[PDB]
Design a protein around this ligand. Structure first.
Ligand code: OAA
Ligand code: OAA
Lengths: 382, 380
């Protein structure tokens, strides 16, 4: 054909069993389970990891064994840590993760796609992702290197290692929920770049490196940070209406954390993050104020844009949740926390692609360039 | 609904840069056939310029252009250490990915900008030479080294890699290879980079994603795999027996044959074949490789030509690189592929972002379980 599939919009790149999105009803399901239902149940993030890799929820016995395999990933090579710590402290957190995974990809010379080993490799890698993200956070904050230790909770192991203090139940539960809510979202740009890479039968780690490279871009990563920076500009909940007039109605700025190219209604992840942000910010005065600004701005934005299908997305409230847990705005750390969660879905999609529907991804382009012409000696060129 | 499997015949962008005729076997860069380019003795730096600017340079333009590329011959210590800290057994192209990823992190002031993109890309072509020299040195257990200005980009590269003055023959061969690998429209590596830069991620991250794809054996590794099959055959009298016992019977894939676009002889393979014959003729032990390769080639075409399956560029390029002086180990040839292809990747990235930017965000067909109630772990 001569038609261009701009943005590959509504091109189906694969079939999946993993995730469905109903952008008109605002329903997000992982293997048939609503994210609302998963969060209401108090499911551990590891159960949902298992769901993505195995296709069903685990028994208590299966979960115990699964957690052991993930925990193998908490031990990573010094050179992987150095791939982060040798970088400028001003580097984006996600580019740090990418530099680390890239080093790992080089070193994993015995990786081979195999139905008998893929899931164990992915599980251990989910552990490695926690180890890496801890050390990205530490480097950024000019703290010593640290690794996660085994615990009954992946969210707990992560937070304790990141901050070097004992996380509270409330902090652990909120991080657990964030990890579940960012687990997957079918085939966004990151998942797609990763699929192209593994479609050449490149290794899992290279697939993740490609996903990271996409996620870094501000049309994919960076949105939670941008929502926070917008609430910070407003500063005071009493000034929301004026700010909205002075910046949004007049078209000076885009409203951050609104709109989505699949959801034309409220993002179900945002609906869940809102309740959590309310609760976690409740007893932290400075964060409470950011929440109050967010909710007042939200009313204005929905009133202005709702009729056009433009509503809060997941990045509107996730920032307040991460801030409340204790992560800072700098270096796009929130986007690194996105990649931490999403490495489950990335790898589940890569496995599903290579194992069951493998085909090299090799599209075409429409040529609009010059007609055939003859090379002229440089001395003759004017 | 319908799955576009392998995105086969899906158009992901328009381009001015490269056209491929799969039936005639013609490959043109901005209207110039690669046969004409090589026959005319083009400098690789001329073709780099063509990609980034849309025309062949004047003498003055080229002089200026070369200066910009040479800025990239200096890269930071931490970039070299991103390579030298890795296990020596790591694939060459994976070492390149680690180095470019480190670079992507540090390049915090990168912004897509019509006024600067080409200069960024030019310098990154220099940095790719620096990176590749260091990947080669690391694998070979040699000291670090940076390329220096010389009469040509191909010379600067070989002299630094090897730590000796390359011969005229070796420099011209490398120059040809760099031209021939410059671009091939939207293969998997270029596609992955495009996906990345479609989020407005930086050029270096686009290169990183391209390298991730190139690592896989359905894209990278074929020139190496071709040499390895020739080395299995061992003696030219054994060609037909090996072919019957390995290829006709489906035991092994015939390496360096077949293409998603070419359904005829790859024009790059045509040019590489002539060079491989001339260079190997001068070195008996490599000439043996050539003799096996050309004997095998006839059998393969005889068997598979009718199916549109012919030699591709990777069938003879391995002989050329081994003649120049590069060894088989660690898939060094695939790093040489990346060294050249970085020009095409960057040129496609700039073209996409500057003139037809849109987030790449496809869909999937759902075939998973229907809606179900979550069940507490205790009750499972
Ligand atoms: O669905 C998308 O394209 C972007 C997004 O919300 C995600 O990756 O979670
Ligand atoms: O074009 C392809 O699909 C693979 C190839 O020959 C290249 O990238 O040069």
């Amino acid at each position: 054909t001569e038609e261009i599939s701009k943005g590959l919009e509504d091109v189906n790149i694969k079939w999946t069993r993993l995730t469905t999105i109903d952008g008109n009803k605002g329903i997000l399901r992982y293997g048939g389970y609503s994210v609302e239902d998963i969060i209401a149940s108090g499911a551990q993030d590891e159960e949902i990891q298992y769901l993505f890799l195995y296709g069903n929820l685990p028994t208590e016995q299966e979960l115990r064994k699964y957690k052991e395999t993930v925990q193998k990933g908490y031990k990573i090579p010094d050179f992987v840590i150095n791939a982060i710590r040798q970088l400028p402290r001003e580097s984006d957190a996600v580019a740090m993760q990418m530099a680390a995974v890239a080093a790992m990809a080089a070193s994993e010379t015995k990786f081979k796609w195999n139905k008998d080993t893929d899931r164990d490799v992915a599980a251990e890698m989910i552990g490695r992702m926690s180890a890496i993200t801890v050390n990205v956070y530490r480097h950024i904050m000019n703290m010593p290197a640290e690794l996660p230790k085994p615990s009954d909770s992946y969210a707990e192991s992560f937070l304790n290692a990141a901050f070097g203090r004992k996380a509270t139940k409330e902090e652990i539960d909120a991080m657990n929920t964030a990890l579940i809510l960012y687990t997957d979202h079918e085939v966004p740009a990151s998942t797609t770049a990763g699929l192209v890479a593994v479609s050449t039968l490149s290794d899992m780690y290279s697939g993740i490196t490609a996903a990271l490279a996409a996620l870094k871009g501000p049309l994919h990563g960076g949105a939670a940070e941008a929502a926070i920076a917008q609430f910070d500009e407003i500063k005071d909940p009493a000034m929301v209406e004026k700010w909205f007039n002075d910046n949004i109605i007049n078209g000076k700025k885009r409203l951050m954390g609104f709109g989505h190219r699949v959801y034309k209604t409220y993002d179900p992840r945002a609906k869940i993050f809102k309740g959590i942000a309310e609760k976690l910010s409740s007893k932290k005065p400075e964060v409470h104020k950011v929440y109050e600004i967010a909710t007042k701005l939200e009313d204005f934005g929905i009133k202005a844009f709702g009729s056009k299908g433009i509503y809060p997305n997941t990045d509107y409230f996730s920032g307040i949740v991460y801030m409340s847990i204790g992560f800072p705005l700098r270096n796009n750390i929130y986007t690194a926390l996105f990649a931490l969660s999403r490495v489950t879905g990335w790898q589940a999609h890569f496995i599903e692609y290579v194992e069951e529907q493998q085909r090299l991804i090799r599209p075409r382009a429409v040529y609009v360039g010059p007609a055939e012409r003859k090379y002229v000696p440089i001395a003759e060129r004017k």
